[PDB]
Design an enzyme around this catalytic site. Structure first.
Site, PDB file in Angstrom:
ATOM      1  N   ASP A  83       0.830  -1.196   0.000  1.00  0.00           N
ATOM      2  CA  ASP A  83       0.000   0.000   0.000  1.00  0.00           C
ATOM      3  C   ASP A  83       0.869   1.251   0.000  1.00  0.00           C
ATOM      4  O   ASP A  83       1.812   1.361   0.788  1.00  0.00           O
ATOM      5  CB  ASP A  83      -0.920   0.005   1.221  1.00  0.00           C
ATOM      6  CG  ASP A  83      -2.221   0.739   0.969  1.00  0.00           C
ATOM      7  OD1 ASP A  83      -3.039   0.228   0.181  1.00  0.00           O
ATOM      8  OD2 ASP A  83      -2.435   1.817   1.560  1.00  0.00           O
ATOM      9  N   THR A  88      -6.660   3.581  -2.341  1.00  0.00           N
ATOM     10  CA  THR A  88      -6.313   2.184  -2.103  1.00  0.00           C
ATOM     11  C   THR A  88      -7.259   1.238  -2.834  1.00  0.00           C
ATOM     12  O   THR A  88      -6.834   0.448  -3.686  1.00  0.00           O
ATOM     13  CB  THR A  88      -6.321   1.900  -0.599  1.00  0.00           C
ATOM     14  OG1 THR A  88      -5.246   2.609   0.031  1.00  0.00           O
ATOM     15  CG2 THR A  88      -6.174   0.411  -0.331  1.00  0.00           C
ATOM     16  N   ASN A 119     -12.603   5.228  -2.088  1.00  0.00           N
ATOM     17  CA  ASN A 119     -12.589   4.559  -0.791  1.00  0.00           C
ATOM     18  C   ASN A 119     -13.928   4.700  -0.081  1.00  0.00           C
ATOM     19  O   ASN A 119     -14.289   3.850   0.741  1.00  0.00           O
ATOM     20  CB  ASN A 119     -11.463   5.120   0.078  1.00  0.00           C
ATOM     21  CG  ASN A 119     -10.094   4.631  -0.354  1.00  0.00           C
ATOM     22  OD1 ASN A 119      -9.961   3.933  -1.358  1.00  0.00           O
ATOM     23  ND2 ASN A 119      -9.068   4.993   0.408  1.00  0.00           N
ATOM     24  N   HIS A 172       1.530   8.147   5.997  1.00  0.00           N
ATOM     25  CA  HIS A 172       0.556   9.149   6.417  1.00  0.00           C
ATOM     26  C   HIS A 172       1.022   9.894   7.659  1.00  0.00           C
ATOM     27  O   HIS A 172       0.721  11.081   7.820  1.00  0.00           O
ATOM     28  CB  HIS A 172      -0.800   8.489   6.675  1.00  0.00           C
ATOM     29  CG  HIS A 172      -1.544   8.124   5.428  1.00  0.00           C
ATOM     30  ND1 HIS A 172      -2.017   9.065   4.539  1.00  0.00           N
ATOM     31  CD2 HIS A 172      -1.894   6.918   4.920  1.00  0.00           C
ATOM     32  CE1 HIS A 172      -2.627   8.455   3.538  1.00  0.00           C
ATOM     33  NE2 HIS A 172      -2.565   7.152   3.744  1.00  0.00           N
ATOM     34  N   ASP A 189      -0.189   0.088  -5.340  1.00  0.00           N
ATOM     35  CA  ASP A 189      -1.455   0.631  -5.820  1.00  0.00           C
ATOM     36  C   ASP A 189      -1.439   2.134  -6.052  1.00  0.00           C
ATOM     37  O   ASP A 189      -2.165   2.613  -6.925  1.00  0.00           O
ATOM     38  CB  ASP A 189      -2.587   0.294  -4.841  1.00  0.00           C
ATOM     39  CG  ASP A 189      -2.212   0.561  -3.400  1.00  0.00           C
ATOM     40  OD1 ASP A 189      -1.092   1.053  -3.149  1.00  0.00           O
ATOM     41  OD2 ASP A 189      -3.046   0.274  -2.517  1.00  0.00           O
ATOM     42  N   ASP A 224     -22.517  10.867 -24.163  1.00  0.00           N
ATOM     43  CA  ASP A 224     -22.872  10.116 -22.966  1.00  0.00           C
ATOM     44  C   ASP A 224     -21.648   9.738 -22.136  1.00  0.00           C
ATOM     45  O   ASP A 224     -21.728   8.827 -21.304  1.00  0.00           O
ATOM     46  CB  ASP A 224     -23.683   8.871 -23.335  1.00  0.00           C
ATOM     47  CG  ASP A 224     -22.979   7.986 -24.345  1.00  0.00           C
ATOM     48  OD1 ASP A 224     -21.816   8.272 -24.696  1.00  0.00           O
ATOM     49  OD2 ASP A 224     -23.596   6.995 -24.789  1.00  0.00           O
ATOM     50  N   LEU A 266     -16.604   5.994 -25.453  1.00  0.00           N
ATOM     51  CA  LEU A 266     -16.766   5.207 -26.665  1.00  0.00           C
ATOM     52  C   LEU A 266     -17.379   6.063 -27.765  1.00  0.00           C
ATOM     53  O   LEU A 266     -18.055   7.062 -27.504  1.00  0.00           O
ATOM     54  CB  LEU A 266     -17.637   3.966 -26.417  1.00  0.00           C
ATOM     55  CG  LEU A 266     -17.172   3.047 -25.287  1.00  0.00           C
ATOM     56  CD1 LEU A 266     -18.094   1.847 -25.149  1.00  0.00           C
ATOM     57  CD2 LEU A 266     -15.735   2.599 -25.514  1.00  0.00           C
TER      58      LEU A 266
END
Ligand SMILES: *[C@@H]1O[C@H](CO)[C@@H](O[C@@H]2O[C@H](CO)[C@@H](O[C@@H]3O[C@H](CO)[C@@H](O)[C@H](O)[C@@H]3O)[C@H](O)[C@H]2NC(C)=O)[C@H](O)[C@H]1NC(C)=O
Ligand code: 5JK
Ligand code: T8R
Ligand code: CA
Ligand code: ZN
Ligand code: ZN
EC number: 3.1.4.39
Length: 794
Positions: free
Chosen positions: A118, A156, A177, A262, A305, A676, A680
């Site tokens: 992480d 995460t 999250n 953190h 991640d 939209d 695509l």
């Protein structure tokens, strides 16, 4: 047995209440059995054998064992062979190339162990093998990239599920999250039990894919109380199971180095110790695999991640400083901002007013408001009901909150979630094993490309995902997957001069001794080019024509009344001419396309809000005679006057800048219709805006693919080897509110706007249903890697 947890620790089957859960997730569901802690979480004598323990009398209460019997059971401490039988640590061994998997008997395929970490900043690798010997060996011995790009939001859960599915968060549903679903009328959260409900998770993660095709998975997840050392022991024991019981793919999660990041920040001196503790676990996994004669068999993926950035409580923008009333809205705060109405039965809630009150309202403002459909297309963050319309792109190192009363503990020194092109958010990837390459470095890639690689490593057919399968084939020593170029759906027409100028009543006017000067040039000399990589393939049923010109070539679409692509090459010494005033408003009919399939000038004159630009700029004509081709009605596309400021500066100034910088460039430009916002190509029915009184659709975006030789010593049209590419998807907005410096000259904001909306070639392909770089002399896997490249400018 039920009610007890004997002969069941970390089992791989389930029954449910009342029978116990003895797996590695029972602690999270608060439903283990009573003897789980004393039977499955043994912790006596630690995790490392010692010399006096070598050959001990097998005492059952120990965490791991050092008796001579343990290897037959598979529950030894990872350093048994080291401190007893004289073996060396896996890191202390030299790098031997694995030209073929050396798996023991019974292994029908190399197992895959995924090691996830992480908040592992990509720059953490430059601490060297003085801090991370085991990880650094994997990196230098196996296959690695300088960094790996996460997905926005760089949080995460969205990334860990993107890793498992190969999907964008908008497609698999984990858009953060914490999120709110208006259909569920519930609030997903990192803490709590709501995240265990399957209704939140879409797509098909890897463990489900493996199980659906016969490959045994085994639980990827671990309750946080289970120590890391026990998680490795559990993975090492599972590999000693019989053949019909042993899973082929494994996973290990670690809350570090994000936990300590953190508290101390990314560049804090305290960050060194959590990395050392991580490398201890990687060393325990490697030593245990080498102990099991599997170090030259397994494939290990060391993956993160997201990254980490310095943030402080003193750096928080508050919405109460911008909005006259913040008690009627709900804000998802932090490194990103999402705004929805706090009350549904409230007409006083105006989204227009909230965007305006947050748009360039104060200098040095550390966030930018966005309607979610107007965010950069590279983010792929809109097509989901859980993503609120109002989005706040927060500057690196900063936070956004609702009001000062809401913040309290500084309860942090680092965070993540910013734009995924920021340096601090980049993470690591290391591929080591019998299928990954040897001492090989690959260019950076996005984590949405890994799911296909992990499926190939297990022989699985991957579920439909957003990775470009084949673009990571250069990571593997051998590749079972072999990508196929999409076949063309609509063959083009090559029309000649079919009509006369009298057949046109489009309402367009244009006037008509430089020719004798051009010929005096051509005649008195002593001594195709515009489509260097094969024409693009149209991957849908339509009707379009290939139009050739002196300076450019276009695939004009008779359904959309404008080219799908315009290709032209600009030399390093190309001159930038002007346009005379009597040609400024000149538009000419194209006698190759029917008047019924041509734009009309009158529609632009009646639409007071709409102007028009050109795909090939008349400013780059090779001659005034050729300049009349640029004014053809088959070359004009509708553009707002505000966007023309961006388009004019790009064509007239920046394309010449790129050619002079990169030894000529090849430009392929065209429109994009994405009403939209699902990323695509839109059919006609979805287009919600036209030129007044006409059937000329208004593009939502305009793209351009700038290609040149990677070896800059060769020009763009004589490139013998690899190609260098850079593309963007500029939003076609009627105002330049996104740029707070739009009042200044174009040289002071336009280029900044274009760097913000950079895009992979693959992004443009989804939005246009075209296929580029089809005839290049590069292997198709190489071209796929080129299409996945994102020029990030940092
Ligand atoms: C990223 O990948 C996903 C999956 O490959 C793409 O989402 C997929 O989008 C298609 C079309 O929008 C969906 O197919 C549809 O199925 C329904 C029936 O369920 C059918 O009626 C429609 O005509 C259409 O065929 C597909 O279900 C959907 N899959 C998932 C998992 O969401 C997504 O478009 C990709 N995004 C980008 C930017 O490429
Ligand atoms: C230590 C805890 C906080 C870890 C939390 C674990 C949680 C995120 C995991 C636990 C079980 C997972 C679901 C389960 O594997 C079944 C599938 C079906 C598949 O089609 C979609 C994903 C899904 C629902 C998994 C989602 C994540 C889960 C809940
Ligand atoms: C194929 C890619 C490998 C990653 C698979 N993968 C592991 C998850 C995980 C497991 C934990 O052990 C864990 C924890 O102990 C504490 C915590 O706060 C979160 C945690 O999440 C996870 C979640 C959502 C989607 C996918 C996931
Ligand atoms: Ca669309
Ligand atoms: Zn994380
Ligand atoms: Zn975190």
């Amino acid at each position: 047995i039920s009610g007890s947890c004997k002969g069941r620790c970390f089992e791989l089957q389930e029954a449910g209440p009342p029978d116990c859960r003895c797996d590695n997730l029972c602690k999270s569901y608060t439903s283990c059995c009573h003897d789980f802690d004393e039977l499955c979480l043994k912790t006596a004598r630690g995790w490392e054998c010692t010399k006096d323990r070598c050959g001990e009398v097998r005492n059952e209460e120990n965490a791991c064992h050092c008796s001579e019997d343990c290897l037959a059971r598979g529950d030894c401490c990872t350093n048994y062979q080291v401190v007893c039988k004289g073996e060396s640590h896996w890191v202390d061994d030299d790098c031997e190339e694995i030209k073929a998997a050396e798996c023991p008997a019974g292994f029908v395929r190399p197992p895959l162990i995924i090691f996830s970490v992480d908040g592992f900043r990509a720059s953490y690798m430059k601490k060297g093998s003085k801090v991370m010997p085991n990880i650094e060996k994997l990196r230098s011995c196996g296959t690695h990239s300088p960094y790996m790009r996460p997905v926005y939001p760089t949080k995460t859960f969205p990334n860990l599920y993107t890793l498992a599915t190969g999907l964008y968060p908008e497609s698999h549903g984990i858009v953060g999250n914490s999120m709110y679903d208006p259909v569920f009328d519930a609030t997903f959260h990192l803490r709590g039990r709501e995240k265990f409900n399957h209704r939140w998770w879409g797509g098909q993660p890897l463990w489900i894919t493996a199980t659906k095709q016969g490959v045994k998975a085994g639980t990827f997840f671990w309750s946080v109380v289970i120590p890391h050392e026990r998680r490795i022991l559990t993975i090492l024991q599972w590999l000693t199971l019989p053949d019909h019981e042993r899973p082929s793919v494994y996973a290990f999660y670690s809350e570090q180095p994000d936990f300590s990041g953190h508290k101390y920040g990314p560049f804090g001196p305290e960050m060194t110790n959590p990395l050392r503790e991580i490398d201890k676990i990687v060393g325990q996994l490697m030593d245990g695999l080498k102990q099991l004669k599997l170090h030259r068999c397994v494939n290990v993926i060391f993956v993160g991640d997201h990254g980490m950035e310095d943030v402080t409580c003193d750096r928080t923008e508050f919405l109460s400083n911008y909005l006259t009333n913040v008690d009627d809205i709900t804000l998802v705060p932090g490194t990103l901002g999402r705004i929805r109405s706090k009350f549904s039965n409230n007409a006083k809630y105006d989204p227009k007013a909230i965007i305006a009150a947050l748009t360039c309202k104060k200098p040095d403002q550390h966030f930018k408001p966005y309607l979610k459909q107007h965010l950069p297309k590279r983010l792929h963050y809109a097509n989901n009901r859980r993503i609120e319309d109002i989005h706040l792109l927060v500057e690196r190192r900063w936070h956004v909150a609702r009001k000062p009363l809401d913040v309290y503990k500084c309860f942090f020194q680092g965070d993540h979630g910013f734009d995924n092109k920021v340096n601090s958010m980049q993470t690591v990837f290391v591929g080591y094993g019998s299928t990954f390459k040897y001492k090989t470095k690959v260019p950076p890639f996005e984590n949405i490309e890994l799911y296909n690689v992990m499926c190939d490593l297990l022989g699985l057919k991957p579920a439909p995902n957003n990775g470009t399968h084949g673009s990571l084939n250069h990571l593997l020593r051998t590749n079972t997957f072999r990508p196929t170029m999409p076949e063309e759906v609509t063959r083009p027409n090559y029309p000649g001069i079919m009509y006369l100028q009298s057949d046109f009543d489009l309402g367009c006017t244009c006037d008509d001794p430089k020719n004798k000067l051009d010929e005096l040039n051509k005649r008195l000399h002593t001594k195709e080019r515009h489509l260097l990589y094969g024409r693009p393939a149209v991957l849908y049923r339509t009707r379009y024509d290939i139009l050739y010109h002196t300076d450019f070539e276009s695939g004009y679409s008779e359904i959309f009344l404008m080219p799908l692509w315009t290709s032209y090459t600009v030399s390093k010494q190309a001159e930038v001419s002007s346009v005379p005033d009597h040609l400024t408003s000149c538009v000419r009919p194209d006698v190759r396309v029917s008047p019924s399939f041509s734009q009309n000038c009158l529609a632009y004159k009646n639409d007071k809000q709409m102007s028009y630009g050109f795909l090939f700029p008349p400013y780059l004509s090779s001659s005034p005679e050729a300049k009349y081709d640029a004014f053809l009605v088959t070359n004009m596309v509708p553009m707002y006057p505000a966007f023309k400021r961006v388009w004019n500066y790009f064509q007239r100034v920046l394309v010449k800048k790129y050619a002079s910088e990169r030894n000529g460039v090849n430009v392929i430009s065209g429109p994009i219709f994405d009403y939209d916002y699902d990323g695509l190509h839109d059919t006609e029915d979805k287009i919600k805006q036209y030129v007044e009184g006409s059937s000329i659709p208004v593009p939502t975006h305009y793209y351009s693919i700038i290609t040149s030789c990677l070896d800059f010593t060769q020009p763009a049209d004589k490139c013998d080897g690899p190609l260098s590419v850079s593309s963007f998807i500029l939003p076609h907005r009627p105002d330049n509110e996104e740029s707070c410096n739009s009042s200044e000259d174009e040289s002071k904001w336009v280029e900044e706007l274009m760097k913000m909306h950079t895009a992979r070639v693959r992004d443009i392909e989804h939005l246009t249903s075209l296929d580029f770089f089809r005839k290049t002399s590069r292997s198709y896997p190489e071209i796929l890697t080129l299409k996945t490249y994102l020029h990030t400018y940092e």
